Amino acid sequence: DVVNQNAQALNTLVKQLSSNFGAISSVLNDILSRLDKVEAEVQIDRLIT
Amino acid sequence: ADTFLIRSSEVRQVAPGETGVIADYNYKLPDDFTGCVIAWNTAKQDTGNYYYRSHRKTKLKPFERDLSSDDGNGVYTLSTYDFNPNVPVAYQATRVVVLSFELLNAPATVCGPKLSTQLVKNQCVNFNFNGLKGTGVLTPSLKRFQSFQQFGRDTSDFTDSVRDPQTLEILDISPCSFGGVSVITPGTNASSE
Amino acid sequence: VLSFELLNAPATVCGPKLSTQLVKNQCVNFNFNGLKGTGVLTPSLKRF
Amino acid sequence: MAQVSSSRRGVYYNDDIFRSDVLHLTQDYFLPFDSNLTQYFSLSDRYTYFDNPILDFGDGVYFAATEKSNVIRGWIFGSSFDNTTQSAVIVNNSTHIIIRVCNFNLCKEPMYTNSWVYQSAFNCTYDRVEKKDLREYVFKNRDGFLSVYQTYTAVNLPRGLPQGFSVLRPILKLPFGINITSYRVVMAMFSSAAYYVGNLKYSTFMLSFNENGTITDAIDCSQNPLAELKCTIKNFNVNKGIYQTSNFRVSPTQEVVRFPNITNRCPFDKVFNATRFPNVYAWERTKISDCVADYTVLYNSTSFSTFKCYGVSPSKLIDLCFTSVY
Amino acid sequence: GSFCTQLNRALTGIAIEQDKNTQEVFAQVKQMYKTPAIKDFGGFNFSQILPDPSKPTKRSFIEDLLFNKVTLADAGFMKQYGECLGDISARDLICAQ
Ligand SMILES: *[C@@H]1O[C@H](CO)[C@@H](O[C@@H]2O[C@H](CO)[C@@H](O)[C@H](O)[C@H]2NC(C)=O)[C@H](O)[C@H]1NC(C)=O
Ligand SMILES: *[C@@H]1O[C@H](CO)[C@@H](O)[C@H](O)[C@H]1NC(C)=O
Ligand SMILES: *[C@@H]1O[C@H](CO)[C@@H](O)[C@H](O)[C@H]1NC(C)=O
Ligand SMILES: *[C@@H]1O[C@H](CO)[C@@H](O)[C@H](O)[C@H]1NC(C)=O
Ligand SMILES: *[C@@H]1O[C@H](CO)[C@@H](O)[C@H](O)[C@H]1NC(C)=O
């Protein structure tokens, strides 16, 4: 149970990267490629938080 | 102050991040642009022929000039346009001025028209030093600034000392909530002291 | 009104940029079909 | 053309804000620690092969010169070094300081007491004419502002370049606005000295301030694992032990772009400048596919009343590829 | 940066405590008494819990049975890092971590 809890916590931490947190995309590459960074700074701030 | 004269449809192009024909080959605003852009129509005052760049190899860097006419031999790359009062709405002559200004820990040169008042010490008052507004207690200070310093900063980026623009000296600023207070009480149903 | 969209599909309309040589096994900045990024490009035995 | 190591040299103030008694780290263009600088030699005439070539500005430059009798006077920046492009000159005699940006007709080699800097200049834009020894300078030019940093000291070195830490100071914020790509060095004429040249690279530095705006020490986080550890723990003194480190070592330097080879051009002169547009209640839809989108051939004739994009930026539109466009 | 130095300090404090717990439990005595040659102490068969000089490992038989019971499907300090260049069937969670 200890080993399974540690593995599940790490896997959940990995899987939580797919949430965009209100940005227009979850991954940062299309955030940087799709917009100028004047508003992509605001987009990246939400992901960082 | 940056001054020029353009068409009426290109007033949207003088903006941070927006592209066009002026923002591409003639005049591009910086990315982190602090300032203010003003544009006003003179369709009658300014008449005649003016020029702009239509072809260039690369994007222009922000705040970069380019007087290099006739790129190559006989390739002018400066297409012209004309100003008369009969020209349509989007094609009218607009005079554009860009005010690029910045403020930092330095003595100020351009200020607004407000009259200075008397300074009150050792009281919780609202202060306005060189446009910086705040609330605190002003005391005489033993701190030592530099020749160009106007205000000092803590490790928490809170301004603790300022330089008086009139009768130059350092003043310390203290919070009005001057300490921690504990209240010791019996039950309210028992007493109220 | 230009309504355009991009997804995991072959592209038909592109900008006027010239392709360059690809460098492998090095940390490079890549621009693949409009997607920018930074990474190391290696030959892949994966199947699409 | 010998390479000389420059240990912990080239530190300047990249920012104009005031900081007191802090440990601040930033990412900016700096001279890397222990980098190799090229050595050039100079000192009527002086002695045979003592000349100066055309160097490369890049995105920043560190110019350190050793002098004995003030043989080095100034620099001439530019892009193509012809009068088809603009140039700037910063030289001096008497106590006369001369700075001007013009279209210059350059000499082959500049001598200046007999003042063979230029033949002639025209269309002068910005002129601000006001008036055993190591002087070093740093020049950068962004957002139409040439910033100048220098320091000046008295030494007694017979040969080589001394090592140590050096912090420079800003003096000028001249708004030139020209494109700077390459420069030269102006040497004087009479009726050993040498200089060294280094280029700035994008790296991460950490600075310590001695509560007066003066930099005490600097750390280049990409030099050795000790400096990377110091930048990771955000301190100059490290206790004995083991610590994990973040990434501060590897950085890309080159670009790879790969687009499909679609050479056909699709008509923006037929969809846009058609014969007769229909009614608003009978609006028409046209599929556009298999072409290249230019958006720059309309710059000559047609001016746009409004061009506003939703979901994309208009400036980033030239670098994008689309799957389906209507 | 201060939001990350706290996390690093907390995790290092966790790791040193995890290293200290095993030190506290097992190493009660600092004298390593060697294993006696015989295993019968007055009719008491101790051969099942003491190590024997006939195995590649130095563990007892009951310890081997205990070590075979726990499956270490999770990894992180025994999987090779260069093994992370596999196929679409090798897209596992450990290499993603
Ligand atoms: C002690 O008990 C074990 C059974 O639990 C006896 O049998 C040995 O078992 C181990 C593994 O459990 C084997 O490796 C040995 O080879 C076994 N020994 C024999 C003789 O078969 C063991 O014999 C007992 N000890 C004594 C001294 O009799
Ligand atoms: C005006 O400014 C000077 C210095 O800037 C200061 O000494 C003086 O007290 C100020 N007020 C008056 C009334 O002169
Ligand atoms: C000088 O330093 C650079 C960068 O560290 C290196 O690439 C070059 O090989 C060095 N040259 C010599 C002669 O050591
Ligand atoms: C300077 O301009 C003249 C004509 O104005 C030209 O003949 C000469 O070649 C130019 N020189 C340089 C170095 O550009
Ligand atoms: C459209 O084309 C016609 C002739 O082909 C031309 O006269 C007209 O100026 C064009 N319109 C624009 C906006 O370029």
GROMACS .gro file of N, CA and C in nm, chain E residues 1 3 7 15 18 31 46-47 52 55 65 75 77 81 83 92 95:
model
   51
  617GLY      N    1   1.131   3.233  -0.711
  617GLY     CA    2   1.237   3.146  -0.660
  617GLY      C    3   1.213   3.100  -0.518
  619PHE      N    4   0.932   3.045  -0.384
  619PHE     CA    5   0.830   2.941  -0.388
  619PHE      C    6   0.886   2.804  -0.425
  623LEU      N    7   1.007   2.429  -0.142
  623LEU     CA    8   0.975   2.292  -0.182
  623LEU      C    9   1.098   2.203  -0.179
  631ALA      N   10   1.366   1.355   0.289
  631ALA     CA   11   1.458   1.250   0.247
  631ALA      C   12   1.559   1.216   0.356
  634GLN      N   13   1.384   1.009   0.613
  634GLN     CA   14   1.369   0.872   0.564
  634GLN      C   15   1.499   0.793   0.575
  647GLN      N   16   2.841  -0.334   1.727
  647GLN     CA   17   2.931  -0.447   1.720
  647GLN      C   18   2.871  -0.553   1.629
  662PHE      N   19   1.803  -2.309   1.404
  662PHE     CA   20   1.809  -2.169   1.364
  662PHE      C   21   1.850  -2.150   1.218
  663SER      N   22   1.857  -2.258   1.140
  663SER     CA   23   1.905  -2.248   1.003
  663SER      C   24   1.812  -2.171   0.911
  668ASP      N   25   2.319  -1.856   0.519
  668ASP     CA   26   2.397  -1.975   0.491
  668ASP      C   27   2.501  -1.946   0.382
  671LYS      N   28   2.462  -1.936  -0.099
  671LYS     CA   29   2.374  -1.856  -0.183
  671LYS      C   30   2.450  -1.736  -0.237
  681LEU      N   31   1.190  -1.520   0.098
  681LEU     CA   32   1.046  -1.534   0.076
  681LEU      C   33   0.973  -1.403   0.099
  691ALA      N   34   0.930   0.227  -1.020
  691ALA     CA   35   1.074   0.237  -1.036
  691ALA      C   36   1.121   0.379  -1.004
  693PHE      N   37   1.499   0.431  -0.920
  693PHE     CA   38   1.640   0.422  -0.883
  693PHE      C   39   1.704   0.290  -0.926
  697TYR      N   40   1.820   0.511  -1.748
  697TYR     CA   41   1.759   0.629  -1.808
  697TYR      C   42   1.759   0.622  -1.960
  699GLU      N   43   1.718   0.376  -2.137
  699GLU     CA   44   1.612   0.286  -2.180
  699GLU      C   45   1.487   0.362  -2.224
  708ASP      N   46   0.584   0.446  -2.101
  708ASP     CA   47   0.544   0.413  -1.965
  708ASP      C   48   0.548   0.538  -1.879
  711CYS      N   49   0.938   0.675  -1.738
  711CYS     CA   50   1.016   0.761  -1.826
  711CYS      C   51   0.952   0.899  -1.839
   0.00000   0.00000   0.00000
